[PDB]
Amino acid sequence: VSPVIATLLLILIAVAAAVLLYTWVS
Binding site for a second copy (CB under 8 A): 1-8, 10-12, 14-15, 18-19, 22-23, 26
Q: What is the dihedral of CA 4, 5, 8, 12, to 10 degrees?
A: 180
Residue 2 host element (H or E):
none
- Please, what is the minimum distance in Å from the beta carbon of residue 20 to a second copy? 10
Minimum Å distance from CB 24 to a second copy? 12
Shortest reach from residue 23's CB to a second copy, in Å: 7
